[PDB]
Design a protein around this ligand. Sequence first.
Ligand code: NI
Length: 287
Amino acid sequence: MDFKYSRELKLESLDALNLTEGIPLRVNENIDLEFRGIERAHSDWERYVGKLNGFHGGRGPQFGFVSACIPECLPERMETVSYANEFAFLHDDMTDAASARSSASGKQQMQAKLLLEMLSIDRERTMVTIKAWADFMDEYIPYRDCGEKFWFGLVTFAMALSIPEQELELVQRLAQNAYLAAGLTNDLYSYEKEQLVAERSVFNAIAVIMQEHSVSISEAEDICRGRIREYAAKYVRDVADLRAKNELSRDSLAYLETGLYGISGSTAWNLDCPRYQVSTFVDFKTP
Ligand code: NI
């Protein structure tokens, strides 16, 4: 990728953790815009939907989820992209909690305001993105909602990418390995806090592995880490081969390369994000 908006960050712990196949960590320079989008999402959520208590979404102590996972996000789209990602965190927690009339009406007002902002930035890519977003708005083999669809919609909007229709099936199929690696790492780092929250009241790969093999948490963590490494290594190999052949469109290769930084960025963010820190646990989280 020809980097214009991000910088590489040295984080030696990633080498020792060995979950990211040596992919470098990159962070968008416009962290301040990401954090502004997060704060506006919180302000709107409290205005339209409900009170926040002990809620943490994409913000981290140094960088946020979007700045690390979409490092080449277009600067003038960062605030809107971060808002939408934070909205998704809020909406997903409320949907988990649930699974009232004025809060659901408030949530559609908040969606409409976001849709208007996106349409004002990029009409055609907004339509691709919201069609991708439509749904959202025993063993490890059956364990796996289409969260890839949210991220596909967000990245293509964030970087003004248009995937040719004739490449979409292939690109989405190859991206699945990056989503599996990042998603398994996510479950690996969220399990402890999730178990704490459930025991005070778990669809997580750690839990699924423990049941499937009748093993302890740390034994399941090792199994999960081995799977993460397989998925990430396969993805890195595929992207490397596609970039060397240079046959796919620039936009499809940009999306797949961004999948690399989604792996390194989400893993680095998981380490100390308050969302998964046990220290930030509260009783009666809202949403
Ligand atoms: Ni290959």
